[PDB]
Amino acid sequence: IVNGEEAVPGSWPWQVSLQDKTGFHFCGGSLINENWVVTAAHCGVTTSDVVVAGEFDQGSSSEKIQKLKIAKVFKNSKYNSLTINNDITLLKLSTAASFSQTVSAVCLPSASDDFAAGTTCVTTGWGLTRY
Amino acid sequence: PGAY
């Protein structure tokens, strides 16, 4: 996020980090329940990648994070890689996340839900702070 | 543009 601010730790409990086997953070995700994560199709997640729940400071070894294995990757069949449209993948976890004060689910909207232009929303992540 |  460019020009964002540090969040209060544990305050966005559905936010997960998608890391590869080398431990490199490559994409974020959101817990929708204990066994499922939603992320972007273009992240190219494989079952060799890990979902890290409960983390605030990735430079810290004393946080009680949950490193969860991915059982199955469900790329939306409508995803179009040429236009990046319908950019959603669901990850089914092999081990359920354990909900706590720092690990919990975000709600999903109704198909019929209305979110108006002008509404102030929030976005979170560990992406670049500068380009 | 670019993916993110």
């Binding site: 020009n3 540090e6 994409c27 992320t39 198909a111 929303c121 992406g127 | -």
Partner: protein, 95 residues
């Protein structure tokens, strides 16, 4: 990438207004946000765009793509969750 989690508040735009920046790349299953002095950027992809509805945070967008330089004056593009929810529920239900 930063070590600690970042956050930012940013406004939703309409698709029509987004098209002014992005043109025909903006599809129905996309939603734009930002162009407000902040921007999602590389490594943010896949993460949430949440809006408070009736007191609870709701997933409205999934960080997707935008400016190659993460420009704070151009809107970021997010996957529009309301257009994809039916697929999520069908998926969870069958698995």
């Amino acid at each position: 990438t930063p070590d600690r989690l970042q956050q930012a508040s940013l406004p939703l735009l309409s698709n029509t207004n987004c098209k002014k920046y992005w043109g025909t790349k903006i599809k129905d299953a996309m939603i734009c946000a930002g162009a407000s002095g902040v921007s999602s950027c590389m490594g943010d992809s896949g993460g949430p765009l949440v809006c408070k509805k009736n007191g609870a945070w709701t997933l409205v967008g999934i960080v997707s793509w935008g400016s190659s330089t993460c420009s704070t004056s151009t809107p970021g593009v997010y996957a529009r969750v309301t257009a994809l929810v039916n697929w999520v529920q069908q998926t969870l239900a069958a698995n």
